[model samples]
Structure formats: structure tokens, C-alpha cells
Target chain A: STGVELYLDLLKRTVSNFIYQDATHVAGLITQAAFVEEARESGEDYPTVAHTAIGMKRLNNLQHCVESALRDGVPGDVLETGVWRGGACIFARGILKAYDVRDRTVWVADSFQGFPKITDDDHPMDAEMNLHQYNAAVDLPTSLATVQRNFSRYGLLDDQVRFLPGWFKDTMPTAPFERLAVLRMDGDSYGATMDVLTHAYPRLSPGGFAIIDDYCIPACREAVHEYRDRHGISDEIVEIDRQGVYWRRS
Target chain B: STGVELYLDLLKRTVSNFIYQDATHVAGLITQAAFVEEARESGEDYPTVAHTAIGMKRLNNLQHCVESALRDGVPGDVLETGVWRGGACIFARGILKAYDVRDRTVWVADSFQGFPKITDDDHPMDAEMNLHQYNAAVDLPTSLATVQRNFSRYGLLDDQVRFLPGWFKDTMPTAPFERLAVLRMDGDSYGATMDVLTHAYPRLSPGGFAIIDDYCIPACREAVHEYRDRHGISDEIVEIDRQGVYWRRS
Candidate 1:
């Protein structure tokens, strides 16, 4: 009992220290590196950029969780829907390769292009959706190609790389993959993330992970909160960094 | 600020729940898997394997700390002075590659033949007196090649791996390494670790990390305390896992 208690205490301390220290440094770096400028150009504010940095830190923590689960013989696939720059996808691939895991697939889902327009009755932020603004500086094919190349560069390209490129509403609900060990949603807007959750939540394995990258952003968190309430799903969501919420499917 | 604070609080709660849940599960699993066998082997009233499992958890937490430090631009080189079975070094290398860090080096230092003899005044666990045990049981002579082959199997031999197979006294004092970003000292005995500290401490980079892996094992901690007092290096050392103490160079 003492050993178990000591071990858990150590893990708690280490994880807290790790997240706070690394996220603080990374958030500062990304802010200084003009992530704010990019967000502003996209009509998102400084908080959006901060949310993105927080999302990345949560992704980093999820990467560790996935590895630990894999080492424990937990069986399931890994997935990330809404790959923007594909940074998190590449991180996942690296974890698989490092752990010498060759059996599971890493599925990356995206529109390749930007989001479609939001319909009426959605949130106010979603109702004013602008496809033109989303498409302004987008280079879909090139960006996805870069993601593919990054995986190869890390020797992570094998039978396990699955790319699903389309709107989540169109592609995710009917996607072939049935069970996932880790699901990460980086869809910036509430509507987009909601679509993925409705479609993919059923497919998550028990004790598997689901990370909502936008849960710390105001509009996105509001969206998920409303949706979860409607669905009667009362699982206590875990937040990491300042922007992400995760839960284990059980 | 309210949003941030709320998010942080939620994140902490989520992490605490997940960690405790997983730890409880792992503890049960370890008990079921090894307790009976361990009791039979050691003829002890309680299971020894549980302690090993707890140790593994501590090691996992320490590995996470190292991973977090590397991600925060702590520089990439990893060095371990006393590697038994090479588990921790392998863990470090796994994390480096998982983060797609290609340029980092992993230096393994060991008196692969055996430790030197201990003098009358030195502690009984001193390397010199313990050489026979190291040679007979620790299998130091065979570990060097075994470790190299292990790394090679993992495709970790990217010209960034080095092995110093001699007494720390002979090999470490004038080593060519300009700076070390991470150093792990696993010398179980006080005398062995002190020798390493004297030689390796000066080479640690500013803001770099040093981990004393055996610091909680009484003898090793005593040695470190003695050396620190002698040098008057009055800095607060942070406890990582239960058995590990670390300091970041200022």
C-alpha cells in the first residue's frame, strides 16, 4: 500500500510539473513566434492563439498517455480529426515508432480544404462562418503532403498511416475504422468539433482517450457543454493546459 | 483570468482522477500477475513483485520528467553513468525519437568490466569492493555489447550514440563532451556515485538537468549529501520520482 501510494504521488507531482513547466514555456514561445498574428488574420483573437498553444500541450500529454496505454497492452487504434498543420499527427506517429508498435493504425482526418458554412440555429459565432476567410491562405494539398513527408522522415510510414480527407460530417460518421484508443479533435469551431464527436464517440474503445482541443476556447467549450447536456452524457471531462478536455471512454 | 483559472482547476481535477484510476488498475494487475510467484520465490510473507511494479511506476514518472524537459528545449543529449539492463537509457532514447529529435546524442558510461576496489575507509558498497558482485551478477562485461545491439535494433545508432566503458575516474574527468543537457547517475552505492558527481557535475550545461537515480536509496543519498556539503553547492534539489532527485543548472 505504501509503495502504491508513493508511486502515485510521484506520478502526480511529475505530471503536474511537466505540464505547467512545458506548457508555460511553449505558450510563451508560440505567442512570441507570431501565432497570434496568424490567429488574428483568421479573425480569431489572442485568446485563440493561447488556446492553440494550450491544445498543443494537452496533445503532448496525450502522447504520453497513449504510449503508457500501449505499453500496458491496451488494444486500440489512434486517431486525430481536424489536422491543421498536422503537428499532432506527426507527434503520434513518432510515439508509435518509438514504442516499436507496428500493429495499430494512426488515422488523420481532415477536410484538406477549410470548413463549410455553418447553418442557421447554430451558435452566433458559427452562423457568421466565412468559407472565404478560411480559404484565404490555405494550401491543402501541400500541407497534407508535408504531413505525409514528416511521417516518412521519421520512419513512421507503414501500413498504419490512414488519411481521411473530407468534411467530418461527410466522412467521419461512415468512416471504416470502428474502434479507437485515442481520439483528438482539433476542429477550431464548435460545430465542426461537435460533428466529429457525434460521429466518432461511439467508436472509442472502453478506457480509450478522447481529447477536445478547443474545449478551452470560449465558443468551442460552450458548444461541447451544450451538446453534452443534450445527449445526457455526464462524464466529468478532464482539462489539460488551458484549452483541452479529455475523457476515457468507459 | 477567470476562464484560465477555471480551466486550470478542471485540468487538475481530471488529471488527478485519471492518474488515480489508472494507478489503482495497474496495482491490481501487478498483484494478480506476480504476487503469488514472488511470494513463492522469496519465501516472504508479502509479495516483492509489488515493490518492483511500484519501482517501475516511479521510473515511468521519471521518464516523463525527462521527456518534458526535452520538449521544453532543454537540449537533447542524454547521458547515464551506471546502466543496469539499460532500461532507463532506452526509455530516454525512445522519448527523444518519439519527439522526432534526430540530433540528440545518448552517452552511456559504465565501468563495463567491473567497478574498482574499495579502500578500508570507503563505504562497503564502494565500487572497488563491489567489483566482484558487479562482474558476477550485474554482468557489466556483457552489458556493453548488449546495450549497443539493443540500440542498433531500435535504429538508434545514428552516430549520436557513445559508450565510455571504463572506470568513471579514468574516463570522465577529461571527456570530450562540451556540455551535457541531461545526466542520470544510477550508481547504487555512495562511493561510486560520488566519483561520478565530481567528474560530471562540472560538464552540465547551464539550465541543464542532472538526475540522481539512487538518491532515495540512503547510501547513494548520503554520498551525494557529503559531496554537496564539501563543494558548498547550496541549491535546492527537486525530488522527481520517489527514488530520484534532480537539479537544473542555473
Candidate 2:
């Protein structure tokens, strides 16, 4: 038990670069603007080595959901939409491995090339905000191999991990998983967020957890509320951090 | 001695992603084109997590040079031009830390925004080949902050790690280092390779190691040979791998 706890605890620290207390990257240099403790815990800055930019609190939240699912005997796999280097998925796999759960798989879904081109017609808010501008400014687009490699780094890459590489609209509709014990969505845009929820939400197990990683974005929030209202699904909304929230499917 | 040796050895593996046996990214997926052992050792394909794409042999070569320099009291710092993600520079810093050497600084020189535009007049061959095409296909442009964050991940970011972010011709001439124990050039284009050698060579200690990471490229190789012939310097060129070569200044 000590070994498992230590290993998983260390994974959280190492993935967030908390062990190194690495600071965030600023205008062509590192700044203490969000360094070490605050940076890792808050996810205010991009971590140097961490696969997920969702920060420590969000990572801990995901761990909590996965462990709950396992204990409750939720019969489904775990899936994450818009996985940025697939850190959360890797963590899910690690948790499962620590507990020796062999039957379930970890599904990683993403464009694997950054967001699709935003059009005013479908995603006016996303277009106006021009999130792709950030993509142009930094290396936000991760290749499929890079994500898989990130998984392999922790000795977690195997048949249990599956990747869906393409636009969310294209891949999510045809998602292969029959059910998901945990459904985590990180797509920042309204359209992308809706695409995953519309296709994958129904497949979430009755007692499964649903995580929203970009609740701070108005568009993402609107989509979540709109979807919840339309489906008449009301699971208690719990805030993981300033930008992340979660709910349990009734 | 055993502790230091083991630590440095592990770093080389981690930085090279050799410990993970990550396969190369190909056509939106991971393939066995070169996985794990062969991939990390050969540098045939881009590594999944390694800061440097120069492979394990070249990395070992770099370690050899830094170790050799420290043992011989070469009396200068270490520097690398065209650091893709500043892996070699990070490695140099790690080596220094392992040996408890604090006097030497590691100079990281690069555009940090990928290669400069290739023009016909100055770089006809580069223009024809269009190396930037590869940059377009993958995430090659690393920000200066990203490089520093990478160093921070290993707890090696400090005053001893200095970054020069701009065109080589602009930054190399004003390099603050008084001398260099190791001068590594990875600029693949002829112009970039020449620019670094011209400005930094004068500051290289007599017994300093000069490593060329792109000897396989005709343009880079030509730049190295031309610089040596023009300067009337004759140092034995030692092959580190198929694409890498090194020489000790005399």
C-alpha cells in the first residue's frame, strides 16, 4: 500500500513538475510570475515537463474520480476528449495499473494537430477570440506520437490505450468505446465541447464522473449549461478549480 | 563517484527518451519505424520526449566532451547553437551539476523561433530543400522560455545558463563568454553553421571540443570544412555517429 501510494503520488508531482518547482514560460524567458508551488497547483502556467497543463488540483480531481469509479465497480472504460499530451489519460492508466485493473482501457481523443480552423458561422465566439492565435504563437499542437510517447514514458503505453486522431466532429461521433466510467473534456471551444458531450455523454455509466476542464471560458460554460438543460440531466456541479468543474451522472 | 555516474547516466536516458523506448511519429500515428532501443540509439526518428533529437550516441559524445573538458581543465564554458528544445544545453548543465562544478556557464544560442527564412542569394541550397517545410509539419519552434523551463525541469536553470535568442549573426558576435570548453553547432543551414563558427571559434579554448551535429547534411558539412580550411586549422575530425562529428581545437 505504501508503494502504490508513493508511486501514484510521485506521478502527480512529476507530471506537474512540482518536484522540480519549475516556473512558467514568459516572453522568451522564464518568469517567477507563476513558479513552483503556485504554478503547479493552480495550473496558471504551462509546465516544463508535465504532460497536462490542467495543473495539480485538476489532476488530483481526476484521480479522485477514477479511484471512485474503481471502488464502485463502475463497468466502463475511462476517456478524455481534447487530451493535450494525454497526461490525464496516462494518469488514469497509471491509477488502473496501480490497482491492477486489467479489463478496462483508456481512450484518448483529440485532433492531434491542435484545434480545427474556426469559422464564424459555427463558432463565432471562438472565431472572435481567435484561440488559434495562441497556437501560432506557441507549440500547442502535439502530434499523436508525442502523446503516445508521453504515455510510454511512464511504462503505461499498451493495448489499454487507444487514440482517436482527427477533428472532434469527425472522431467523437464514431467513438468506439461502449461506455465510459469517466468522461473528461478539455476542448476549449463551444463547438468542440458540444461535439464530445453530444456523442459521448450518453455512453457515460450511470454513476460515472464527467469533468469539464475549461469552465472558465464563457463559450465552454454556455455549452455545458445548454447541454445539461436540453438533456434534463442535473448532476451536482462541483468546482475543481477556477477553470475546472465536474459532475457525477445520475 | 558511483552516485554521480548513475545520476548523469539516467539523465542521458531520460532526456533521450531512451528509458521509454518511444517510437517515432509518422503520418498522424506511432509506428515501429524505429522504436525504443534503435530509435534512441540511432537518432533516426524524432524522440517523443527528449529535448534533443541528436540521439544517444551524440549525447554520449557530448557527455564525453564535457567530462573531458572538466578533467583537462579546459577553462571555459559550454555552448550549443541551434538547440531545438535546448536538450544538449540542459544535458551540459546536468553534467556540470553532477560533477559539482559551478564556475562554468552553458550558453544556449538559437533563434528559438525555428530557422531563419532561406533566401536564394545567401542560401540557395537551403532554399531549394526548404528545411522549413519540416518545421511546418511538426512543432520545431521552441520559445526561449520553453528552453529555460526545460532546464528548470532538471533544476539546472540558473545564472550559469544564459540564453541568446535571435539570429545567430546578431547574437553570436556579442556572446559574453570569454572562452568556451565545448562549442556545439546544430544549425543545419550553411549560413547558420558559418555564423556561429566565425564568431565563437575565436573564443574556443585551444583544447576545446567543437561538435558538429549535422555533418550528414551537405550544407552543414561544407560549412565546417570551409571554416576549417579558411582558418588554417587542422584538428583531427572524429566521428561520433553517422550524422555527428567532433574535433578538438589545437
Candidate 3:
């Protein structure tokens, strides 16, 4: 099932690329994050920020896949939770800009306020170890500002970068974005990951991709496993890297 | 278009392997033929029979591709004009044996009579110089006997292998095959190649594959070129090897 889903997703992406004439930039960034996280975890030196741009090409590919699917009659908006620096948002905005499809809104949700405190159920023994190096300075607003600046720098500010400045639980339930074809969750903690799954998953359109950025981390993986199992959803987890997993809604 | 056709063919083959629970054989065979052919042509004598088996395995992949296409609702019959040692046909028959598709037929067409005399407008003068040494008694009936033995060896006689003896001209037009889905032409002479094209091409079904095993050779290439120009069949030829070319009906 994993291989079939991947194959179909890849086929859709191929068709999308053929029609859009460019790769999806957000998909590129996600993959970029994949490579970066992989390199970091593998004890390899972090690549320069330019390495992130290499991932841009594949993101563009993903965008093309999404666009092509839409052209072939798949109707949906796009959403990305846990915006980080908003690279994925910028990529999505670029696709909208290129296609001149202003009607489809991109919902960018983030606590920008950084990850929440870990509870006993969410990795009981490693709570202190996880929180020890956590940076409290990074918040949703700051991350959104960085994304906004990046978009503006790229001359991509036309109807770009919609920011939801709160935790996913507080914001996603009320988020106006509907019929999401691309839902990216980069929440780095177990609670954040679970929160997005509970709030945003029911709205995912058929053929949509739910990209989870922290699925490789034990805590995050456990949270998704439990949530999916509880819901009686027998979906396979596609491991993208140490930081990500993606599944397509059929 | 050639690249697209090749990609689709490869995709069909991939899907076929997935459906048949024979993915191991599929993966192993794709690269084997080229590898063995390379070593043999390069005169690397170590593990000679092993290399030959590898080549046979590669041919099996091609056979699998054709079989997969058939299983996926490809209409019409199967025909192979070149039945060298009958390895490919054996594999094709094996698929038929597995599927128990009784209505469909396999037509093996060949001169088996060795290379015909090269003419002034086609082939180098020494074309037949190295031919007679390969096998003195090689002919259609003998080759068909070999194929029959192979089918019996594999216990695959239920899916009948019909042998059409003589050159493409004497046998093709009157051949019992109808709506061919797979037409593999292995004749090496320019005249023989042209004769088969003129006679059998019109019978190919839509989406059918016409594999020319000699198109990479100079004389055969010229013949196909001239034939295409004359007939105005605009499909570009796909090169599979020094002796192989393929095209699919759109």
C-alpha cells in the first residue's frame, strides 16, 4: 500500500510537473529540510543555506503535481501548519502567483511561539532532556515575520503569506482555509503533531498530501501512531527523513 | 515522444510486476541483458554462460513488460518475428501459462534459415561472412522444434506457440495473427525489415508495440528510415540496443 500510494502520488506529481512547467517550491523546501535534517543527524556538516535552494526545485515539482491535479478536476485549497521560516508558504504563494489563481487561499498556521512543554505521556523520562536546549525566544509571530520578509525579498508579496499566530489547537479549528490539497505539519513536538492531526486531518481532500516534519523523532512518531490507531485509520507512515513523513489522502 | 513511450512502457512493466507478486524477478532482469551483452561483445570470457543467463534474464524483463501490457487490457494477439533460441517466447508462454488466458495466441515468425544474402544498397559486404559459423543447421522448423522443446521443458504447452516459417514476405501477409499487440521484428536485413513493416504494421492495434531488433544496425536503420518516409508514419523509433528499436501505436 505504501508503494502504491507513493507511486500514484509520484504519477500525479509527474502529471502536475508536465502541466505546470515548474516543480513545487514548498515540496522542494520540505525535501530540503529532509536533506538538511538527514545531514545534521548523520553527523555530516550542515550544508550552506544554498543547499535549501536545491530542495526548492523538488518543491516546485510537488507544486506542479498539485497544480496538475487541480487542472484535472481536483478542487482544493492548500494549508501548511508550523510555518517555520515560511519557506513552504512562499513556495505555495509562488505557485498561486504563477498560475494567477487568486481565489485559492493558502492558510499558514503556526504557534510561531515555538513548541509547548512536554507532558508525562509525551516522552516521560526525556522531558527535561528535550526541553533543556529548547529556545523560548522563537515564537509564531517572529517566525511569521521571517517568512514574510523572505517572501517580500523574493518579490512574491502579492496575496502572499497568510499567518495564523497561535498554537495549532488554538488556531487550526478556527482557520477559514477549506478543502486542503496540501497539508504540511512541521510541528516538532508530540503534542503539536497530534494537535494538527486531530484538527486538520478531517479536512484533507482526496489526493492531498499530509507531510509531517517530525515523524522520525520517536515522540512525534508515537503520537501519530496512537492518533491514527485510535481513529481506526490504517494509513501507512511514509518516512521522508528524520524530520518528516507524508501520507496521501485517497 | 520516444522518451514518453519508454517511460509508459517502463511504468506498465512496473505495474505488472507489482500485480503478479513477482517483483524479485522483475527487478533482477531489467539490467541483466545489457550487462551480459556488454561483457560478451567486449570479449570478456570469464563466466561466459553466466553472462548469457543474465542476458536471458534481461530479455525476460522485456517479456514481462509485454505480458504486463497484455494483462492490463491490451487488446489483440502477441507476435515475435525473431525467435532466437526462443528464450523470449518461452517467457511469454510462461505468462500465458500462469494467467490461463486460452483465447489469446503467440505467433513466432522467423526465417531461422540464417541471414539472407546482403544486397548492394544494404549491409556491409562481410555481413554474412561471420554468419554461417554460428550454427550450420539453423532454420525455421529447427528453431521452432527448439522452441517446442523449451515449452515442453517448462511444462507450458497449453498456451500454444505457433511457428510461421520462412521470410516475413512468404509468411506474414497470410499469417493467422489478428490485431497484434506485440510485434517484435528481429530480421536483420534491410529488405526483410521493410517487408515485415509493409505487411504486418497495418495489423498492429492501438497502443501496440512494434519492436525492430535490427534498427540500430546501419542497413536496417536506413530501411526503416526509408520506410517511414515513404509511409509517412511519424512515430520516432526508440533504440533499445545496437540491434533493437521500438515504437508504440498512439
Candidate 4:
């Protein structure tokens, strides 16, 4: 708790409007604008709350949901479909340790190949969308190794953390997981997004959480509404900044 | 680049129509409905970004203006007359090293004491507005020390930073020696807001910036317009965000 955070702590105690916390503890993650500049200077832009991600308002929300699930015994493993550099998954592991839960597995799902190619037959709107054109990167092998290394850095790498390294369409359906206490899907796109909803969400427990990160794109929004409409998953859509939205499974 | 940044970099590169900069690089700054939730949990009604601030948009604009000035080698220092926990000022210093400008300084000015007491002879509207109730704080000595220490974590605390620790009415006129490339004022009152224009704006070098944050209040706006009219300092009041306005000194 340095700088603005210590100041934040002071503001929290003194100001009439400060927010008290469940201690996301990730508080340490966002404080260093100076540190981030160094990273930016080195040409790395992926900012991490704890370098394993533990980032964004959504993850903060996810922490509460999972903590509540832990508190209330909402059953299932924590699974997030896209694990780019493993920040979310890393934070997921962090939450598991914070709760001291030895049972639940942290599922890391990604092709590590970045966003899949948009095809006219399978993903027309994604093709014409003129967006994330989500291109592949350094390939799955290095991505998997580096992502694992990220968890290792946090001393969170273990069997309790599972890795499913393939596109959602290719691997999620039969990925050997049962119930889901928290389903955090950041696989961005209409097809891959729909894949997670269709395959992964049915396993979301009655009291569990489902998070979606691709709804900002038109195709993903279309896919989300269509799936929600078709399935009648009528939970209020909670906004998580501009990047994602979430709801409780009914 | 790594993690969500790659996604963002991709978002910006391919997702035409993305905001290029000013995500606060500390964008994590505003995320975490989780942290904000603590506010709701504590029953805080004012959203920090908007109520606690003019909000992120203006912060981003300020960042760009300062960065542009630094990039162009615009001379003089950066000064924000009121440093309530120092976001704008903290960010100002962040940009100095980000651009590697060693000579420029970040001047931190504040009453350190919160608001000044509104007297019968004081700005009438500020008194009627009913707040601050004008209390003070650990006052400037502690504040001055803390701000510099906060910069220490980022390795940003150095002689390039200067502190002006008193009400603008007292310290600003005679204390500083030179020109300014950016003048940001968040002190919210006609008298205090006007004080900067009275003593500080005259020091703002041509091609430099003037940002006013007291505009949302009636008396503050009155102070600004009255001062501008009297000074003939017309440079088109550009909206910094809905809450404030800024301009380059013509």
C-alpha cells in the first residue's frame, strides 16, 4: 500500500465517499503508474494487477462471486475459457488459495493462438466486423509454457490448476469438467463466444456465476442475445466496465 | 505487449474506432466495480470517477495535452494548483519521466487544509453551496512529504518536482520563478479559481495549456468568464470533458 493507495487508504478512512473492501488484496496491483511506464517503455502493454492478471474490475467482481460461492458452498471448479498470458486464470488461482480451497480446479482454456480466423461459413459477421481481427500469435506451445510460467511465478502452479489448450469449439464440450462455481469466459468472438455459452454454461451450477467479455462487439452481442433469448437465462446483465458483462445462472 | 493489452493492442490496431490513448495506462484505475462496490457496501452514493472527479475522460485529455507538450519540447513546468490526493499531479509527473524530460517540474500546490472557510465577505455561492464545510487535513507538511514518497515507489521523486504548499492566494504570486507549459486548477471556488488566473495564468507560456476544473460550480464559472473577459485571454474554451474545460494560451 504505497503512494496513491496509502492515500486511498487515508481517503477511505476520512472521506465520506470512500469504498470499504473485501480486500481484493489486488489493491497492490493497480497502484504503480510509474512501474507501468517502465513496462510501456519496454514495449509491454499488458498491465497486471499482480502480473498474473488479478486485474480489471471484472476480476475483482469474479473474486467476490467466487468468495461468496466459497462462503455459501456454491459447487464447481472455476473455469475461464480464454487464458491470454493467464492473468484471469492466475487471479482465479489466487482466489482459490486465498480461500484455501484444495478441491476446486482452475481451468485454463485458450488456443494460445490468439483469436481464430473469421470464416464466411462459420463467422460472417466476425469477418465483416472490421475488428479484433484476432490474429494468432507466437503459437500454443510457447503460450502454454509462458502461461504456466506465470502461474509458477505466483507459486500457484499445481494439479488444482488444469489447462485445456485448444479453441473453445475444438475442446470445451468434452473437457472433463463437471459443475462450475464460476464460469469466466473472455474468448472474444461470435463463434468462439457462442461455443463457450453452448458448451460450458450448461454446467454452471444453480448458484454460480457466468461472465461474458465479448459482448462489446456486434457479432458477440448478437451471439449473446440469441443464446440468452434461446435459453431464457434471465438474470440481470451486470456491467463490468466496457469490456465485459455478467449474470448469475438461474 | 502481453495479456489483455495484446487484446487491446489488437483492439486498437484492428478494431478501428478505438480510443488510442488516455486509458490512464492506469485504466485499472477505474475498473473493479468490485472496489466501487465497497463504496456501495459502505453506502457511498457518489461514483468516484464522475463525482470524485470530472472523470477519466478529462484525465485522458489532460494526459494527451501534457504528452503532446512534452513531445514537442514545449518549455516550462507543469502545475496543478490543487492536489486533492494528487491524481492529476501524480499523472503529470508520470508523463515527465515517460517522456524522459529531466528539466521540467511538477509543482504540487494545495491548501493541504481542505477548503477554506467561506466568510460573509468570501465568494457568496461557495458559501451557499454548503460543503467542505472547508475543513483542513494533515495539512501541507505531511501532504508534501507523502506526495514525494508516493513518487518514490515509481522512482519518480527527484528535484524536478516542486511543491507550493499554501492557498493560491498566498503562495502562487511570489513563489515561482518561471514559465509554465500546463496549469491545472481543481480548487472549486470563484475566489480560489480566480486566484490562479490572477497570479498563475500570466505565467503560462504561449503554446502552453490552461485547464480549469472549478467550472461546474456557478461561482467558479463566473470567476473564469469574468477573468477571461478582463484579461482578453481568448483561446476558445475547449471542453476537457463535461466537467471542465482547457485551452492552449494563445
Taken over the whole model, the C-alpha lDDT of each candidate is 0.58, 0.80, 0.55, 0.63
Top DockQ prediction, candidate number: 2
Q: In model 4, where do residues sit more than 4 Å from their true spots? A: A1-250, B1-54, B134-142
Please state the interface RMSD for every predicted structure, separated by commas.
19.3, 9.7, 17.2, 14.1
TM-score of chain A of 1: 0.72
User: What's the ranking of the predictions by TM-score, best on top?
Assistant: 2, 4, 1, 3
- The sequence of per-residue lDDT tens digits that candidate 4 reaches over residues A67-139 is 8889888999999887766756766775666446789999999887676665566778877763344232222
lDDT of 3 by residue, A1-250 (tens): 1222222332322222221122222221234323343333222222222212213233544465467656766567777776655555665765665455667767778766556656565565247446324343222234666666555643455554567888677887768777777777766567777778888888888777777665656767777888888988766666554355677677
Instruction: Evaluate model 4 with DockQ and give the value.
Output: 0.02
Writing each residue's lDDT as its tens digit, candidate 2 over B110-164 gives: 8888877766567666787677767744467899988888877666688989989
For model 4, the docking class works out as: incorrect
List DockQ for all candidates: 0.02, 0.03, 0.01, 0.02
The residue pairs that clash in candidate 1, if any, are: A239-B11, B116-B128, B117-B128, B118-B128, B118-B129
Fraction of true contacts retained by every candidate, in order, equals 0.00, 0.02, 0.00, 0.00
Task: Give candidate 3's TM-score.
Answer: 0.39
What's chain A's TM-score in each predicted model?
A: 0.72, 0.94, 0.69, 0.76
Deviation (Å) of A161 in candidate 3: 3.3
Worst lDDT run of 10 residues, candidate 1 chain A, spans A17-26
RMSD to native, candidate 1:
20.1
Give the DockQ of candidate 1: 0.02
Off by over 4 Å in 1: A1-56, A71-73, A117-123, A129-142, B1-250
